Design an enzyme around this catalytic site. Sequence first.
Site, PDB file in Angstrom:
ATOM      1  N   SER A  26       3.771  -5.067 -35.171  1.00 48.88           N
ATOM      2  CA  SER A  26       2.550  -5.526 -35.803  1.00 48.88           C
ATOM      3  C   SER A  26       2.809  -5.856 -37.263  1.00 48.88           C
ATOM      4  O   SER A  26       3.575  -5.212 -37.980  1.00 48.88           O
ATOM      5  CB  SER A  26       1.396  -4.562 -35.614  1.00 48.88           C
ATOM      6  OG  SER A  26       0.179  -5.287 -35.763  1.00 48.88           O
ATOM      7  N   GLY A  27       2.199  -6.969 -37.663  1.00 53.51           N
ATOM      8  CA  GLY A  27       2.402  -7.495 -39.002  1.00 53.51           C
ATOM      9  C   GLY A  27       3.478  -8.564 -38.985  1.00 53.51           C
ATOM     10  O   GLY A  27       3.280  -9.656 -39.510  1.00 53.51           O
ATOM     11  N   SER A  58     -11.033  -2.858 -38.487  1.00 51.07           N
ATOM     12  CA  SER A  58      -9.891  -3.499 -37.835  1.00 51.07           C
ATOM     13  C   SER A  58     -10.322  -4.380 -36.672  1.00 51.07           C
ATOM     14  O   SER A  58     -11.255  -4.022 -35.948  1.00 51.07           O
ATOM     15  CB  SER A  58      -8.917  -2.453 -37.301  1.00 51.07           C
ATOM     16  OG  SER A  58      -7.715  -2.991 -36.758  1.00 51.07           O
ATOM     17  N   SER A  59      -9.630  -5.523 -36.492  1.00 55.06           N
ATOM     18  CA  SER A  59      -9.832  -6.443 -35.375  1.00 55.06           C
ATOM     19  C   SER A  59      -9.245  -5.865 -34.109  1.00 55.06           C
ATOM     20  O   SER A  59      -8.491  -4.882 -34.198  1.00 55.06           O
ATOM     21  CB  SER A  59      -9.091  -7.740 -35.640  1.00 55.06           C
ATOM     22  OG  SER A  59      -9.580  -8.339 -36.824  1.00 55.06           O
ATOM     23  N   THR A 110       0.879 -14.726 -35.339  1.00 53.04           N
ATOM     24  CA  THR A 110      -0.400 -15.428 -35.317  1.00 53.04           C
ATOM     25  C   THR A 110      -0.324 -16.758 -36.063  1.00 53.04           C
ATOM     26  O   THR A 110      -0.696 -17.863 -35.642  1.00 53.04           O
ATOM     27  CB  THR A 110      -1.358 -14.411 -35.998  1.00 53.04           C
ATOM     28  OG1 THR A 110      -1.017 -13.147 -35.421  1.00 53.04           O
ATOM     29  CG2 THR A 110      -2.840 -14.711 -35.848  1.00 53.04           C
ATOM     30  N   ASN A 152      -9.071   2.592 -39.525  1.00 48.42           N
ATOM     31  CA  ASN A 152      -9.561   1.470 -40.287  1.00 48.42           C
ATOM     32  C   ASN A 152     -11.019   1.156 -39.975  1.00 48.42           C
ATOM     33  O   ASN A 152     -11.422   0.831 -38.853  1.00 48.42           O
ATOM     34  CB  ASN A 152      -8.667   0.272 -40.000  1.00 48.42           C
ATOM     35  CG  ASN A 152      -8.945  -0.921 -40.894  1.00 48.42           C
ATOM     36  OD1 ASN A 152     -10.000  -1.031 -41.519  1.00 48.42           O
ATOM     37  ND2 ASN A 152      -8.006  -1.847 -40.985  1.00 48.42           N
ATOM     38  N   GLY A 178       0.020  -7.544 -31.526  1.00 47.72           N
ATOM     39  CA  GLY A 178       1.358  -7.136 -31.925  1.00 47.72           C
ATOM     40  C   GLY A 178       1.512  -5.635 -31.850  1.00 47.72           C
ATOM     41  O   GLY A 178       0.644  -4.929 -32.360  1.00 47.72           O
ATOM     42  N   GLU A 209       1.498  -1.822 -31.647  1.00 43.79           N
ATOM     43  CA  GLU A 209       0.982  -0.876 -32.626  1.00 43.79           C
ATOM     44  C   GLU A 209       0.859   0.608 -32.254  1.00 43.79           C
ATOM     45  O   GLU A 209       0.933   1.094 -31.107  1.00 43.79           O
ATOM     46  CB  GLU A 209      -0.327  -1.405 -33.246  1.00 43.79           C
ATOM     47  CG  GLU A 209      -1.455  -1.720 -32.270  1.00 43.79           C
ATOM     48  CD  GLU A 209      -2.692  -2.367 -32.879  1.00 43.79           C
ATOM     49  OE1 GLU A 209      -2.577  -3.423 -33.503  1.00 43.79           O
ATOM     50  OE2 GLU A 209      -3.786  -1.836 -32.726  1.00 43.79           O
TER      51      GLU A 209
END
Lengths: 744, 146
Positions: A178-179, A238-239, A183, A235, A455, A457
């Site tokens: 992730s990160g 968060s999405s 995308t 969070n 991604g 996580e």
Amino acid sequence: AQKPLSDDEKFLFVDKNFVNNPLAQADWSAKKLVWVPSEKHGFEAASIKEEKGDEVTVELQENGKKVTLSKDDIQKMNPPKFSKVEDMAELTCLNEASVLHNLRERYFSGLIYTYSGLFCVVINPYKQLPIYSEKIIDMYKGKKRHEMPPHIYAIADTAYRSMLQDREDQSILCTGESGAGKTENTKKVIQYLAVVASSHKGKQGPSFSYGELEKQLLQANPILEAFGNAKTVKNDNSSRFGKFIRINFDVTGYIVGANIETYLLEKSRAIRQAKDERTFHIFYYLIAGASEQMRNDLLLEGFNNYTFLSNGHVPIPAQQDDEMFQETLEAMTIMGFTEEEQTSILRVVSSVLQLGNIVFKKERNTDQASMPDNTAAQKVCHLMGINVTDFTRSILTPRIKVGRDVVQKAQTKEQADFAIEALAKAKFERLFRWILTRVNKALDASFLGILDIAGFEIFEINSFEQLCINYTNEKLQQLFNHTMFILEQEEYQREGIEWNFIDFGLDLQPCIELIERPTNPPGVLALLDEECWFPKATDTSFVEKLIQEQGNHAKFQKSKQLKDKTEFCILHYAGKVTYNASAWLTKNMDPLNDNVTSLLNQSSDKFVADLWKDVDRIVGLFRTVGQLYKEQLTKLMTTLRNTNPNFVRCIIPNHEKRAGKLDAHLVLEQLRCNGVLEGIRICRQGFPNRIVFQEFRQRYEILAANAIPKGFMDGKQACILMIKALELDPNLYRIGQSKIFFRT
Amino acid sequence: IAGASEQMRNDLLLEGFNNYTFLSNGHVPIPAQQDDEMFQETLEAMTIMGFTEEEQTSILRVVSSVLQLGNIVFKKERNTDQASMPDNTAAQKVCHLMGINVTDFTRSILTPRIKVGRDVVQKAQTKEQADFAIEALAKAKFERLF
């Protein structure tokens, strides 16, 4: 000795302009120089001093310390010339020590993407590197790869070019945790085709006139962030969603069709929020921005006087639900929802409050549960373009039909409030996918498929939402392996061509089994499909069945004693995670009821008829969510199998969100995870391409008019005439039985 | 093959009698007609009807690519069983008189990027599947020609 390289362009081209030093040529006298194991550097530099059978008193030339080490520990030293290279496959010495080494000194110079034989490594910089605009389209435009250095617009042309050439149907799949950067290396490709592959009514920085279809093409994202995101422990905003594209082309190759798909949602909390957590954004907002008049009109019960706005009103840091009502009311207008649709999206607050209420609240007495509110179903099926009665009927009683027996029966809570949580939240999903419909509608011989993975996580409370997140990753990963190790060398046996077989130990299927394997001893999903169809089965006995079946597996691990919370720590390709199992059983179930799916298949309105014509998978006798999402990922993965997997393999430097910060052992973990060293070890050896010898004789007779003179023989030898008359190398090609195997 | 002049003997790609497998019984002679000169004759007859200055050699080529296809031999490569094709002049001399796409002839003749349902489906062809289809191609080109 070349030109000065731009400060910016150092991030594209290697800093070549260094010094002719003799030391790099004198030092070879220390002929036992070797790479040696190191926790902090990965490997480092030493020298053999004394040969003890299979030991050798090796001595460090960094710390000077004698360390007696074995013939097998010591790994071959590469020549200094290979520093920070353009392709990793060029490193004469391949061996882990140094296949690791190429990246560390590279990223810190700016040089992010790097070719690695077949696939290309794309690390995260966390810095706005200026490598986009029509400068970088038209620099790289239509471009034979060697004239443009390792960067994305090369993969993007190579898709559009190859499709009209070799005519494989081409695809693009971006990988890594992730990160990492996936995308965004998807969206940039839509920018590319809108100018390059389209067509034009006649006919710089951002500017050019793209066509009509190509203009509509873009304006999607900002809505779903309110009606879908919700306050967690990790969070507060968060999405939780992730996507795909197909791009159909005409006879001449232009953009004609374009087909976007998203995968799965944190769809669960509305009817269970943990202590100090919150629900989907908008509820709290409708109670807060509540003018008295519409407090009566829009049917507002007050603060706390709610079934499941748990923990009363939990506030939020640095955001005020009050005002946020207006902002998130504004977004829906852009790609285009009307005010009928928006008095309806006002009663989509009443429909996400009542998709906290279209849940067949476990019916304590009979067990097969039922529909609390008519108005809620009424809101829902009209806003899914089908019928409200026909829905709920099926959503209680599947009126199916095997043999004589019209398999008319009740569904359980788990079955029915799954096909109605699988449709309260395939309301929340195929109505997220209704935003996806409202795009594709203006968007749809050859096609291009592209995939933005959600991604890999680690939350603290990971759950099915994350079970799938670190499943897509894993599932794509055994695709990579089967494509690029096993099947390859099978064909290498076949053709008569000289190459001996190597195994790599890269079937990662054991972690993927550990989740996905239906028969034999089953993994997480399979035990949970079975457990989803089960009354004796508690999220508890799911983890008890997981300990029962797996236990001793060299990729699996129990909780840190928390059987009480019921959780399991697992080694996935990229290491370890904890999932928590409370309310997982239902989250694997989605028993895609065909009764509804078919009313949706034959739906009337502007909403649905498009997005449910995928009638194939559906329960004609059959599938769950776990299964459905193995299968949705198989509609993907097995047509991907039959397309070209151009992989955009994204690599994380740090978990600290930072600029600058690399960790070479985190990367070396993600190298073993991505299966890098061995993906490079095959593609150094063999010959990626494969075609026959006629692609030689025709396209170049023009190149050398004299080559075949009076008289002709075998096709191989005759092409070998123009081959040697154009100096073509006896190991660049492999003129096999059928195929010229072609290298990079 | 017989009345070839040395220029179009190497242009329309002529090896000798029995270098084509699809001409069986070797070369059977005919009574009281000798194929040799009968070539030269028919070529005249073309010019009398008004078969064009280039066209004559084009009809002769389509013929000769049909003559050519049967060098395409499929040997049971017996580790898929989905076996493919050794020589290329087998296809080459065929496809220089065809001018289709050279890449894609064999890549079709071995991997049909075909159609099951109403979409694109890939398969490698077996030895068996590859022979029979190419055979049909050989003959069918002569029919299209007539």
